[PDB]
Nucleic acid binder design. Structure first.
Ligand SMILES: [Mg+2]
Ligand SMILES: [Zn+2]
Lengths: 419, 214, 52, 94, 95, 153
RNA sequence: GCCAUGGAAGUCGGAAUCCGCUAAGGAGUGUGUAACAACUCACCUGCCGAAUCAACUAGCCCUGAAAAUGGAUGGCGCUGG
């Protein structure tokens, strides 16, 4: 399914960060990604001879890890019938962790989609970097920012915005020198401005060209007072590139905010991007907040209560978040219940106690909130919208409003409506 | 009429000797480097050592035309022409101001201000960017935290932290520029302090600069 | 721009109505059957959608 | 018991609206300034200058003229029980 | 009306009605009242027609004539709330 | 600013969910520390809910006990006190005495929130039926107990 | 209101559904509400004075009912037949 696919993209992102985080105290793990074409017999041959060699490495801890890891992966493939289709991930090792845990480890899996790596790595940590590279599939979009003040170059992923380079040039200004020069000032100044244009042009060729062929997918030129148009129409600007001029964008003051505005003018050009869909959705959500219609709902305290009652058209959530619900549980009455506690009251506080009875009150195995939405969103009837916290609106709503909220089915004025 | 009314009107702050300052408007090379700007504070006795701000370079001013006349001394509050013998030349900004080398002027990355929001118009959540306008100085800026709302008429500022603010509500807010930048106080210099909020074809807000974080 | 009384007045004559599911006709709000013969005095109505 | 003022029933006598503060923040002045009552912004908070009698003997109480009685919840004349005649063992008293 | 003001003028001592600048249209509506009807602009009111007469039928039909004459074609009427509308029906002298 | 407020509190037991900040919050005293102080001052009801009034000022709150009808009948019952959770299948088992109900009718008539004996026993027992009990029989029983077996002064 | 619950305080669920003034007032139809606010509902006084209201069923008529040379209750025509 498609919705389950997107759940795997975030789920895989979260799993990968862990596989990358685990560490050895002073030892090496074998990571072995086997590709789909090979035969098991051939793998057992290549490795059994590499095995008779690994038989005589000098170190004790490394040697035993290699030799024991080779026997383990063979036993894991003894579990695998054939090199399975579309890849084979394998991760054997001896990971130490906090609390002093000399832990042996074996993590074997058929991959979900085709995987290309033919990894072999006796190393301190595991590697699903292949998985995240496989997950992040969208082209990078460069941005050139020009101004009489100074330049700036920056790229643009699906959600993430990056900055590549920026610089200055001391182009002396219009007043320059009066009487004698003023009449021939605009001509000399246009030459000098064009020389600045040559330098900007050179940077765009450097960046956006790749062997007279663009490697990055899009290129958004940008400037004010017709800086970008000279860059577009200039002959230094490459013809194969004129074929692919995606857009030129005007800005004010000249810079990063203007870089952001030029992205806002782009919006319709980056329709495929979730960042653009987010910009448009959160643009409507702020239109709801501006208007009195009272569709908005906000905060986990109110939004989760609002979700429970229903009423929720769009539930805007950051894909990671890391906020939790403390499920309390009793012995006798069997009343499981969730509680949303602030940073002060959650960490150091005496509210998880029965007190009346005279006991300390526990909680039971929690669950992720986003995985819970994906599990039972059709039950509630709410449009889950996956946002990051990188973008100006997503990062903002993420920091202040818990990276969660929603457009409601109807009006609920909170200042009007006590309770 | 207008110019006769100026003749009958002497009501203007001369801007008199204080800690010497000179905000730099623009620059160019004509056998050196001339720059323009209104002396918001203090004096500058041409053959004398200045320092710029906030990047902080020592610098001697080669020549001046008080608007259109060669002079040695000058009091503040005047559109001055100032040609420098720059040791630092190409990483100077239009906007970095000269100050006294001893009586330095504050400048700072973090600062608080009472902003009166005219037209964002969207909600102004923590972390929006614009440009910060300080008469000659001008840097791109972001606001990290949003302290609180305040009324326009009879302004008694509230206790509890608000969750958001809509288009018009006035508020006290902290503004972080990208780089180092010339900021003054409303008490010390309002001429040095009153600043702008800026993005698209939309005026965001007026700003009221209060603090200078070092 | 315009007074809310005179607004609600135009709401009266244009927006506050009922529709026949069948012939998409326009009826008075406190109706029970349609008027048109082509639909057959249908009980099946709905209120006109209010503009936001 | 003084109940809410009705925006609609007939008036036996003149209904009155005394000069008294609203008890709110910045609100829409159009309800008071529509009719004809002097209302000033005494620093944010609105203050009433002059006293004017809106409704006369026998007049329909509008919602706008009703709103200030609904805010005060103070009837000029209370809903009640009116005496007709006394009757004592076959004896009428006017 | 919302934005464009409707310049109204009476011809033939309240028999005829010229209505100009409706939605900024160049067409102008020369509406004719019925016989035995007296159109009149009231005083002390900015936007107020007054139709007087004996026969209610002729009065009310002529009212609907002007009403349906000023009608918005091809547009969302729920939004564009323009045009003349009847407010208060009463008598010349009360009883 | 004085303000009275009704609260069907969990009792001596500290309730998880609170409805105190919406009514109390605008005035001034912190709502939860009062909720805990109210449950601590209460105590002997312990598990079951009590309608706690709160006369609130700008600085701080004031507590006043209002024993409910259903609550006073179940205390007449000897019940297990329980936590906020209040387990399922709590049908009350015992006998509400007719004299005890007359006493609770006197308690509600003392708060001055209902009728002369006929009405106040009924409101307290109609809520008792919500409790899930019997006054050695329901009102069909008490009609016969009333007839030729009256407990009236 | 208790039980549910987090809250059903008239308006998920689930337990409730007895009493008061009574002319009548549900632990509540909708808008609008987690429940109130604001608009609003069942129920009754004021006047009113004879027949009224609900659900079904079958009789006639109507809707449902579109095809190609110009067209057929046999035609003309027929509505106190
Ligand atoms: Mg159209
Ligand atoms: Zn129809």
């Amino acid at each position: 399914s498609a919705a389950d696919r997107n759940v795997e993209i975030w789920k895989i992102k979260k799993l990968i960060k862990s596989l990358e985080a685990a560490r050895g105290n002073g030892t090496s793990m074998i990571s072995l990604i086997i590709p789909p074409k090979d035969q098991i017999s051939r793998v057992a041959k290549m490795l059994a001879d590499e095995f008779g060699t690994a038989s005589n490495i000098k170190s004790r801890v490394n040697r035993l890890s290699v030799l024991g890891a080779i026997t383990s992966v063979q036993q894991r493939l003894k579990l695998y019938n054939k090199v399975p289709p579309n890849g084979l991930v394998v991760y054997c090792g001896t990971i130490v962790t906090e609390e002093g845990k000399e832990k042996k480890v074996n993590i074997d899996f058929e991959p979900f989609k085709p995987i290309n790596t033919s990894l072999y790595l006796c190393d301190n940590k595991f590697h699903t970097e292949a998985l995240t590279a496989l997950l992040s599939d969208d082209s990078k979009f460069g941005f050139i920012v020009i101004d009489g003040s100074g330049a700036l170059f920056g790229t643009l992923q699906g959600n993430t915005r990056e900055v590549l380079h920026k610089f200055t040039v001391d182009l002396p200004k219009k007043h320059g020198r009066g009487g004698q020069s003023a009449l021939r000032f605009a001509r000399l100044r246009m030459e000098k401005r064009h020389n600045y244009v040559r330098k900007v042009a050179e940077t765009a060729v450097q960046l956006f060209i790749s062997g007279d062929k663009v490697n990055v997918a899009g290129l958004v030129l940008a400037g004010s007072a017709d800086f970008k148009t000279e860059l577009s129409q200039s002959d230094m600007f490459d013809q194969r590139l004129q074929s692919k001029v995606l857009k030129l964008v005007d800005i004010s003051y000249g810079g990063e905010n203007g870089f952001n505005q030029a992205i806002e003018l782009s919006t319709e050009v980056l329709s495929n991007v979730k960042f653009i869909q987010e910009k448009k959705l959160i643009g409507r959500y702020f239109d709801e907040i501006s208007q009195d219609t009272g569709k908005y709902c906000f905060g986990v305290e109110d939004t989760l209560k609002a979700l429970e009652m229903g009423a929720v058209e769009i539930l805007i959530v950051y894909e990671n978040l890391d906020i939790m619900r403390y499920v309390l549980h009793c012995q006798g009455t069997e009343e499981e219940k969730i509680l949303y506690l602030t940073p002060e009251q959650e960490k150091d506080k005496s509210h998880f106690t029965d007190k009346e009875t005279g006991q300390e009150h526990e909680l039971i195995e929690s669950m992720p909130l986003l995985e819970w939405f994906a599990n039972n969103y059709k039950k509630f009837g709410a449009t889950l919208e996956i946002v990051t916290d990188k973008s100006q609106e997503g990062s903002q709503f993420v920091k202040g409003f818990g990276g969660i909220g929603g457009i409601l089915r109807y009006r609920v004025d909170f200042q009007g409506m006590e309770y | 009429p207008f110019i006769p009314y100026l003749d009958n009107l002497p009501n203007f702050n001369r801007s008199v000797d204080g800690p010497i300052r000179l905000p730099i408007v623009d620059k160019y090379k004509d056998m050196g480097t001339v720059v323009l700007g209104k002396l918001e504070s203090g004096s500058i006795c041409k053959g004398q050592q200045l320092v710029m701000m906030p990047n902080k370079h020592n610098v001697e001013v080669l020549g001046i035309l008080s608007d259109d006349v060669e002079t040695d001394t000058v009091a503040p509050g005047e559109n001055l022409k100032i040609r420098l013998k720059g040791i630092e030349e190409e990483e100077i900004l239009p906007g970095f101001i000269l100050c006294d080398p001893n009586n330095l002027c504050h400048s700072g990355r973090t600062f608080d201000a009472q902003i009166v929001i005219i037209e964002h118009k969207s909600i102004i959540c923590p972390g929006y960017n614009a440009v910060l306008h300080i008469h000659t100085c001008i840097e791109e800026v972001e606001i990290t935290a949003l302290i609180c709302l305040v009324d326009k008429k009879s302004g008694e500022k509230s206790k509890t932290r608000p969750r958001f603010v809509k288009q018009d509500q006035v508020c006290i807010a902290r503004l972080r520029t990208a780089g180092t930048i010339c900021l003054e106080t409303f008490k010390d210099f309002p001429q040095m302090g009153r600043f702008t909020l800026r993005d698209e074809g939309k005026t965001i807000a007026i700003g009221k600069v209060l603090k200078l974080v070092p | 721009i315009i007074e809310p009384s005179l607004r609600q007045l135009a709401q009266k004559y244009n927006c506050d109505k009922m529709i026949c599911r069948k012939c998409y006709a326009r009826l008075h709000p406190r109706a029970v059957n349609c008027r048109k013969k082509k639909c057959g005095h249908t009980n099946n109505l709905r209120p006109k959608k209010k503009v936001k | 018991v003084p109940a809410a003022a009705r925006a609609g029933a007939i008036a036996p006598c003149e209904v009155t609206v005394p000069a008294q503060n609203t008890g709110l923040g910045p609100e829409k002045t159009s309800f008071f300034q529509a009719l004809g009552i002097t209302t000033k912004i005494s620093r944010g908070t609105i203050e009433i200058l002059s006293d004017v009698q809106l409704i006369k003997t026998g007049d329909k109480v509008g919602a706008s003229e009703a709103t200030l009685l609904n805010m005060l919840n103070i009837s000029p004349f209370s809903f009640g029980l009116i005496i007709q005649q006394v009757f004592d063992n076959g004896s009428i008293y006017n | 009306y919302a934005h464009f003001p409707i310049n109204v003028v009476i011809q033939e001592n309240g028999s005829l009605v010229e209505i100009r600048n409706f939605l900024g249209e160049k067409y102008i509506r020369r509406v004719r009242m019925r016989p035995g009807v007296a159109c009149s602009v009231s005083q002390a009111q900015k936007d107020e027609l007054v139709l007087e007469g004996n026969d209610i039928e002729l009065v009310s039909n002529s009212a609907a004539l002007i009403q349906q004459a000023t009608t918005v074609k091809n547009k969302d009427i729920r939004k564009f709330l323009d045009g003349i509308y009847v407010s208060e029906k009463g008598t010349v002298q009360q009883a | 600013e004085i303000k009275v407020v009704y609260l069907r509190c969990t009792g001596g037991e500290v309730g998880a969910t609170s409805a105190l900040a919406p009514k109390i919050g605008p005035l001034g005293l912190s709502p939860k520390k009062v909720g805990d102080d109210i449950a601590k001052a209460t105590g002997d009801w312990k598990g079951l809910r009590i309608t706690v009034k709160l006369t609130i000022q700008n600085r701080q709150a004031q507590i006043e006990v209002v024993p409910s009808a259903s609550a006073l009948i179940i205390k007449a019952l000897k019940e297990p006190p329980r936590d906020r959770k209040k387990q399922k299948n709590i049908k009350h088992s015992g006998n509400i005495t007719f004299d005890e109900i007359v006493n609770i009718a006197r308690q509600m008539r003392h708060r001055s929130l209902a009728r002369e004996l006929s009405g106040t026993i009924k409101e307290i027992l109609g809520t008792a039926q919500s409790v899930g009990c019997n006054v050695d029989g329901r009102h069909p029983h008490d009609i016969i107990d009333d007839i030729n077996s009256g407990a009236v002064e």
